Design a protein around this ligand. Sequence first.
Ligand SMILES: Cc1cc2nc3c(=O)[nH]c(=O)nc-3n(C[C@H](O)[C@H](O)[C@H](O)COP(=O)(O)O)c2cc1C
Ligand SMILES: Cc1cc2nc3c(=O)[nH]c(=O)nc-3n(C[C@H](O)[C@H](O)[C@H](O)COP(=O)(O)O)c2cc1C
Ligand SMILES: Cc1cc2nc3c(=O)[nH]c(=O)nc-3n(C[C@H](O)[C@H](O)[C@H](O)COP(=O)(O)O)c2cc1C
Ligand SMILES: Cc1cc2nc3c(=O)[nH]c(=O)nc-3n(C[C@H](O)[C@H](O)[C@H](O)COP(=O)(O)O)c2cc1C
Ligand SMILES: Cc1cc2nc3c(=O)[nH]c(=O)nc-3n(C[C@H](O)[C@H](O)[C@H](O)COP(=O)(O)O)c2cc1C
Ligand SMILES: Cc1cc2nc3c(=O)[nH]c(=O)nc-3n(C[C@H](O)[C@H](O)[C@H](O)COP(=O)(O)O)c2cc1C
Ligand SMILES: Cc1cc2nc3c(=O)[nH]c(=O)nc-3n(C[C@H](O)[C@H](O)[C@H](O)COP(=O)(O)O)c2cc1C
Ligand SMILES: Cc1cc2nc3c(=O)[nH]c(=O)nc-3n(C[C@H](O)[C@H](O)[C@H](O)COP(=O)(O)O)c2cc1C
Ligand SMILES: CC(C)=CCOP(=O)(O)O
Ligand SMILES: CC(C)=CCOP(=O)(O)O
Ligand SMILES: CC(C)=CCOP(=O)(O)O
Ligand SMILES: CC(C)=CCOP(=O)(O)O
Ligand SMILES: CC(C)=CCOP(=O)(O)O
Ligand SMILES: CC(C)=CCOP(=O)(O)O
Ligand SMILES: CC(C)=CCOP(=O)(O)O
Ligand SMILES: CC(C)=CCOP(=O)(O)O
Ligand SMILES: [K+]
Ligand SMILES: [K+]
Ligand SMILES: [K+]
Ligand SMILES: [K+]
Ligand SMILES: [K+]
Ligand SMILES: [K+]
Ligand SMILES: [K+]
Ligand SMILES: [K+]
Lengths: 207, 207, 207, 207, 207, 207, 207, 207
Amino acid sequence: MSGPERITLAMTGASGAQYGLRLLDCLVQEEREVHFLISKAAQLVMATQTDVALPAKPQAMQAFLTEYCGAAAGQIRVFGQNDWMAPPASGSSAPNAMVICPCSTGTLSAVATGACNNLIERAADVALKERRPLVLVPREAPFSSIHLENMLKLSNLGAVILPAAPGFYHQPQSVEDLVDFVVARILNTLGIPQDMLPRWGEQHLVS
Amino acid sequence: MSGPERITLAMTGASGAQYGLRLLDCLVQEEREVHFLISKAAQLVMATQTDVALPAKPQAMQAFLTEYCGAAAGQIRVFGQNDWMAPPASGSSAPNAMVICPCSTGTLSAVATGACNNLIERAADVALKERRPLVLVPREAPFSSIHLENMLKLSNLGAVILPAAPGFYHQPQSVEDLVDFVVARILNTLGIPQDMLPRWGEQHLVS
Amino acid sequence: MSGPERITLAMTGASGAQYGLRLLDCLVQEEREVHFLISKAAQLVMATQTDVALPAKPQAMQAFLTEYCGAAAGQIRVFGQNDWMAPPASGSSAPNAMVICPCSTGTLSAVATGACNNLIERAADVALKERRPLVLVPREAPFSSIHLENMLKLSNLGAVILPAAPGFYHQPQSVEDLVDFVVARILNTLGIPQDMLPRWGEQHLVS
Amino acid sequence: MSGPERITLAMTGASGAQYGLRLLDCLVQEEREVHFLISKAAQLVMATQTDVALPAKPQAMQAFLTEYCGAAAGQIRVFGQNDWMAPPASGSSAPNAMVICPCSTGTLSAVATGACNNLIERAADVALKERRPLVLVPREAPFSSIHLENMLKLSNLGAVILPAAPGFYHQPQSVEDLVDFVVARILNTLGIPQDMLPRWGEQHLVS
Amino acid sequence: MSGPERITLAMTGASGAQYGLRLLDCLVQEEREVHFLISKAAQLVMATQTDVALPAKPQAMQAFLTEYCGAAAGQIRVFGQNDWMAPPASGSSAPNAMVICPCSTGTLSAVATGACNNLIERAADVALKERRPLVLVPREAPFSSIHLENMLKLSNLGAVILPAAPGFYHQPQSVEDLVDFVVARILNTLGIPQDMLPRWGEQHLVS
Amino acid sequence: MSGPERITLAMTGASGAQYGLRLLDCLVQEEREVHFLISKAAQLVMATQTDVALPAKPQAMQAFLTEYCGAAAGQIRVFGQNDWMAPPASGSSAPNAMVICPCSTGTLSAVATGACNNLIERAADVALKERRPLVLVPREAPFSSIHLENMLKLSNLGAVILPAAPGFYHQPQSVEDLVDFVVARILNTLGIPQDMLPRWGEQHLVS
Amino acid sequence: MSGPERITLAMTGASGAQYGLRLLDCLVQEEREVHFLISKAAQLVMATQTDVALPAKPQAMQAFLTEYCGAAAGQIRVFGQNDWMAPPASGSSAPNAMVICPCSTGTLSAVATGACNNLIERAADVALKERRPLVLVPREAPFSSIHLENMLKLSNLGAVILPAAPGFYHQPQSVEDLVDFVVARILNTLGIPQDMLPRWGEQHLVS
Amino acid sequence: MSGPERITLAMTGASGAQYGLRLLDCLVQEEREVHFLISKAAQLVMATQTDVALPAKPQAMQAFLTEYCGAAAGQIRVFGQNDWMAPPASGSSAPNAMVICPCSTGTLSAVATGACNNLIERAADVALKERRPLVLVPREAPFSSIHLENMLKLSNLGAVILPAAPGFYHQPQSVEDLVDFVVARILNTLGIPQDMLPRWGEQHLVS
Ligand SMILES: Cc1cc2nc3c(=O)[nH]c(=O)nc-3n(C[C@H](O)[C@H](O)[C@H](O)COP(=O)(O)O)c2cc1C
Ligand SMILES: Cc1cc2nc3c(=O)[nH]c(=O)nc-3n(C[C@H](O)[C@H](O)[C@H](O)COP(=O)(O)O)c2cc1C
Ligand SMILES: Cc1cc2nc3c(=O)[nH]c(=O)nc-3n(C[C@H](O)[C@H](O)[C@H](O)COP(=O)(O)O)c2cc1C
Ligand SMILES: Cc1cc2nc3c(=O)[nH]c(=O)nc-3n(C[C@H](O)[C@H](O)[C@H](O)COP(=O)(O)O)c2cc1C
Ligand SMILES: Cc1cc2nc3c(=O)[nH]c(=O)nc-3n(C[C@H](O)[C@H](O)[C@H](O)COP(=O)(O)O)c2cc1C
Ligand SMILES: Cc1cc2nc3c(=O)[nH]c(=O)nc-3n(C[C@H](O)[C@H](O)[C@H](O)COP(=O)(O)O)c2cc1C
Ligand SMILES: Cc1cc2nc3c(=O)[nH]c(=O)nc-3n(C[C@H](O)[C@H](O)[C@H](O)COP(=O)(O)O)c2cc1C
Ligand SMILES: Cc1cc2nc3c(=O)[nH]c(=O)nc-3n(C[C@H](O)[C@H](O)[C@H](O)COP(=O)(O)O)c2cc1C
Ligand SMILES: CC(C)=CCOP(=O)(O)O
Ligand SMILES: CC(C)=CCOP(=O)(O)O
Ligand SMILES: CC(C)=CCOP(=O)(O)O
Ligand SMILES: CC(C)=CCOP(=O)(O)O
Ligand SMILES: CC(C)=CCOP(=O)(O)O
Ligand SMILES: CC(C)=CCOP(=O)(O)O
Ligand SMILES: CC(C)=CCOP(=O)(O)O
Ligand SMILES: CC(C)=CCOP(=O)(O)O
Ligand SMILES: [K+]
Ligand SMILES: [K+]
Ligand SMILES: [K+]
Ligand SMILES: [K+]
Ligand SMILES: [K+]
Ligand SMILES: [K+]
Ligand SMILES: [K+]
Ligand SMILES: [K+]
């Protein structure tokens, strides 16, 4: 397989739960293992703004998502926000790529300053210290200088800042086509195959 | 009226021509005067990726857009990329708010470094030196450190960096609802009335 | 009216609950709408160091403060520390000026780094990204370099750093006259009328 | 009226006394109140290089300028260099816009570093802490790196750096037309009406 | 004795003469030697805003303060603003702790930039080069970025920035109790005994 | 194969056309696909200073280079300076390593500031945002501070700055041996096999 | 002769064509060789705002200026905006001092960032890398922070930033006397004799 | 003579001994005095990679080089790596220009940080403190960020960073023509006559 075997996928409380769910579904279809983390605010976002009824407790959530995605047994692991026994809490874990999708401005801040107040924050701290892939998908507008300084610091350290800013050059016909644009760019960044967004200019031989 | 009487609206060659057109249409409906600028690459973007057939020459373009938006005579002015006689080229002009929507990474760079290679770039140079509103709507993913340093410099100087990153909390049902989300935030930033996005929590009295 | 129609007033756990209460009372008398936020530590400060018995729950608190200030019905809204449905959580809300009075060093830190761990912190994140007024009233001594770097970053971004450092040039005769000095400066910063502190030198014609 | 009711106009010892006098005269004609400050070196500049015989003492100076400009009684207030009873010494004063025209490199330095050795310097310190308009009109050539760092620091904080660098695009026929160019830009910056410099391109409809 | 034998106490022209006088009185009661410096603006502040009639000349002032505080003969030394023969002008002097209380923003600026235009400024220059204690008690609101950068530079070099920002956790009943709060913190910083402010939590054994 | 399948090779107007041609020829022999870009100034450099007669138009150029290198059909693609349909214009393209050989100081500047005025500049903007290899081969002497700051910024972001500074430790006998030294280092940087420069010390077992 | 034998004089599109022409005329009278460069925007400025009818093409322009100034044959050389065969394009050229008079903010930007999009920009890049004199004569008001950062960077590298900010201490009676003031300062900076501005205080023996 | 009478020529252990020898030979032919310094690693480079058999000891080396270059008696002085009696060790010496050709990355580091571990390093420390010419000829590829930061620091202080990066615009036919290109640029930087590289465009009159 091209790309990582295991992805830590953290959802935080920005608008854009759709991107996180679609990414989870694509990662499952490419037979990757997913370590799934979700914040309390992202639970509120999904509950109040989508019609996905995600159970609260980690075991019930793991069962629901496994069904939602047609995943294989053990393929999706769910860990709670203080579960320091989970692999992402330590750099001695097996290597995983991490994506925070969507990434709230508060989680962006925590990651940039090294705050470790929950497993999502610690898992990012670990990704950075181990030089493992870390992709952040912020969804905010406007971006303040605080936001931008936090993104720049992390980009300078090798994190990928991939805003939830879809393009229109594939002639999107639905919300889903926009969601898929961003998910495709994430998978491209991770080096995981995707067929939602063609390779620009692949057939163009001469100008 | 709340907000500026005159907006300089510059379209550049990022993906997202839809946002610029929708904004132009909303600004016309709020009876503002619009000084319209468009780059050669943004012409290519509109031509090759929308089904708006925008004429090439400024006078023909002014006629087309006036029709497209139902604008009043003289309400939309169009200026070409080297027309230094246009009001935006000088700070002695009547005050206008400026929005670059969408804003390519190259135009973001030019603005942040003070390059003045065309009227769009000069018009931004002028907005900043006069302390007149300047809103940039970048549409790129990922954002590199180069992009982020350019946005941060400009945000620190009082420009508003408003990425084309729509939210989902109004339950969007179409591409157009996403486009309108970003346009609404622009109009909110400018202080111009809009009814596309409700005021969050306006009826919420107690927690 | 001169000045903002709506103020988000956040009280945090620094010494100086008196300033926050006096400001709330003045804002009510100038017929402004107040969105009131208070941290758990500021509850402890008021409980253990004032003889204002503030109820714990938001609805009971809203009733108490409305009585305390002689406010009109709906004039004071109270929101709890995780109530993301409240207007201050989103920039799509109606514009409000925000004052954090008093501002603990921990809340100063959170605001300067973009941490968003409660509604007060998020509401400040929003104020800054929207370019809406944000006034911080720290009460600490000494100020460390950490404190000072956090204040400087925010001042450079357009927040007003207004320490709880009263002046003596109005010949204060009581604690209340000192409290009113600081409240007056806040209201002056906000552009809201006040008659507690005269306009210096207004009658002085020549030197 | 558009623009501020009251302007603090400080003249310091750079070459260009003409600009300060012309500005004072225009501000009087637009019926603004002017709080006039002048340094000892600027007195020497006016005395030795203009044929305006400005009296030394504040009361005599106030009488002379009131005559010179055709001002109304009390319209021009004059304050001496240590008169801390004057409104500009305190932020509790009524709001004024401040212009230092011309601005010597030493006064530029004092303002940028926060030195408060006289009323002009203090009045600028106050303008900056209150977020009130502050315009500096330096007249020096070359600009050293010291000068440029001082201007940049202040520009970054929201002061307007408006060098005494007139333009030629109105076809100036006299020294006075050059002086008026700079005065016009000052008044434009302040938001005060002026008819000396037309609005560039106001009649230009299309390119 | 705990703490320094000799304190250089400089009063400058900020509002808050009360703090400087109260500190002088406490230092006298703890049998310390005080080298007293006062600026011309601080003389104006005391004259116009307190009912302490401080004589102008150093010898007359030394006599007055010695009486005011019940000091011993030679215990208070007074030095004028250009008296370079005074111990504080040279680092070869016997070691003293220095406190500038209150500290105007102009004196803060001078100290941070190394300006040495009077004995107070030089005495601070010396304190910093000798690594002797230097405490600054600014009294200003708002603090501008200029103020904050000057405080941060000095704090980073080991000066103590102790704003005149009293706390309310000792249940102050008068202006004097607020003044004493700040004076207590100064004496704590200096390591000099004081009984005005109890030791927080000294009797609290367990949570 | 070790190393990238596809290289974007941009030639710009520095002295050293020989290096770009030799690299193109080596890349062809290692059966890589080459997306070839050349600036107008680099055309002038090749025309006026080499005896390679490179046709002007992209299709004619593609035919000429395919012959020059003995390339396979479609192996060399040529794109013009505004051809935004070419793969290098978008990060959604298939991954390529990019080398700018030689790299003029103006192209170095454009890349470091994010200017995107042609396809070479955009292609570098894309390489950096996608974290794809980007190698710059400047040929200038002296290097100014402007040059050096631009190289440092890009090196800090992960671009490889490989000046056209050949070594002499392989005992070069001709200009071609010097050219091959630099080309070898490029291919080593890219991870592409080369046999022009031996592996230093590969047979040295002990000191 | 004192000063340089050869000056590269670049005119760019700021207001102030008069200064460039007057300087050219003075340089000719001091029998210097002038390599003359002019941008397209500066052609528009001269055409639309002076009554100097400057031919478009370099040879016709060289003939016109030679007549205008009474220059000797070959004394004025004119080079077009892409003529890389001209001496200023290379540091291997004979040494020249360079002056950009007037200097637009866009040309200031290009020089400060190292952009080399035309011969003027390259010629400045070369001046800086060779440590040859480079004088920039900006004419803008206000100066933004972008402008000021660009000037500071270049001043720190040894370029002379000489704004078109004339002085009044020679009692100017006409526009021409103001123009000559700035030209005199340029010639003083270059070390070329001039008799338009006396040497300040040359006859003053004692104070 | 144009240029310096005395050059300190230091050879260090980068590849490119040829440049140092050729420069020494040209300096001798222009009848300059040369103070020659060579590191132990540069001895190894010359020994193992050239067929110049340079004696080890300073006196034997001085004799050999005097013969090699056809120098006059005393024209070449050789000093060993700890000979602090040599003129270059002190700024009280007669002024010399210094060139380090070639300049290893370790010697570049030492110079940039002020390390003074041998006479070459000290001689550069002295050149910089005396503001005497200092030219560094690094020969490395790639340049790391460490290298680039060290070059930038020194360039900012007025050292000339002249990489061993020859140009091809004189149609080089041999290794020697490339070596001579770099040597010519060095001599141009020093202001010493050379006829190896023509003056670009000297005969080009018009574009
Ligand atoms: C409906 C809803 C939408 C939100 N949308 C955003 C958003 O788009 N961007 C953002 O930064 N925060 C948004 N927030 C706020 C955060 O959820 C909040 O700041 C929270 O503290 C984030 O916590 P977390 O980072 O642990 O998920 C939203 C909250 C809610 C309730
Ligand atoms: C179809 C198309 C889509 C593009 N989309 C983007 C984009 O989303 N973001 C971007 O920064 N550049 C995009 N570009 C590239 C720019 O158009 C290019 O860098 C150009 O130089 C911008 O010039 P301008 O800033 O003058 O409009 C796109 C180009 C094309 C043809
Ligand atoms: C009685 C009392 C007084 C306090 N006074 C201060 C103070 O003056 N300044 C301060 O920064 N923190 C003070 N604190 C501490 C904070 O309350 C504490 O750091 C807390 O975490 C702040 O949380 P908050 O920012 O959410 O309100 C005080 C706490 C108590 C109990
Ligand atoms: C005739 C004259 C002209 C001066 N022109 C300038 C000038 O153009 N720019 C400047 O910075 N200083 C100029 N100075 C010097 C200042 O006046 C001097 O540095 C003084 O200290 C400024 O003090 P002030 O800032 O309190 O007015 C001039 C002085 C005189 C006498
Ligand atoms: C009544 C009065 C009150 C003042 N209060 C303050 C103050 O609170 N803070 C301050 O920085 N300056 C204040 N100033 C201004 C200064 O005294 C002024 O800037 C002066 O130059 C300070 O000089 P000094 O630092 O030598 O004492 C006040 C002045 C007066 C007359
Ligand atoms: C013959 C010739 C040689 C040049 N050599 C160099 C060089 O070695 N380094 C350089 O930075 N620029 C050199 N230039 C200049 C550039 O070509 C010029 O600055 C141009 O604008 C670069 O444009 P480009 O980056 O789009 O290729 C040379 C130009 C010519 C004509
Ligand atoms: C009549 C006229 C006057 C101008 N005056 C100025 C000016 O004073 N300062 C400036 O920076 N730009 C001015 N500009 C704008 C520039 O000419 C413009 O930004 C252009 O791109 C500069 O290009 P250049 O630097 O290649 O000459 C003016 C343009 C015109 C038409
Ligand atoms: C054959 C040879 C070639 C070397 N070439 C280089 C080179 O090109 N660049 C470089 O920085 N170091 C090169 N080095 C390494 C240095 O000589 C080494 O780092 C040494 O410590 C430099 O010491 P010096 O600066 O006192 O001369 C080379 C060494 C040898 C043996
Ligand atoms: C949960 C855990 C064992 C953390 C320690 O991990 P690491 O050594 O800090 O990478
Ligand atoms: C096109 C024009 C007159 C530009 C000059 O404007 P400004 O004086 O630089 O604001
Ligand atoms: C609670 C809420 C809808 C937050 C989203 O606000 P915004 O789009 O980030 O200003
Ligand atoms: C002259 C005077 C009362 C200065 C105090 O003003 P502020 O409180 O520092 O704005
Ligand atoms: C007044 C005096 C002797 C100052 C010299 O003191 P120091 O040597 O600078 O500490
Ligand atoms: C030419 C093109 C479709 C550019 C958009 O690419 P990307 O989304 O900015 O990587
Ligand atoms: C036009 C030309 C030969 C440019 C090369 O000059 P240089 O070697 O970069 O000073
Ligand atoms: C070898 C020697 C006398 C070094 C002292 O030189 P300098 O005073 O540091 O320039
Ligand atoms: K598109
Ligand atoms: K949502
Ligand atoms: K007072
Ligand atoms: K003009
Ligand atoms: K308290
Ligand atoms: K070698
Ligand atoms: K004058
Ligand atoms: K060449």
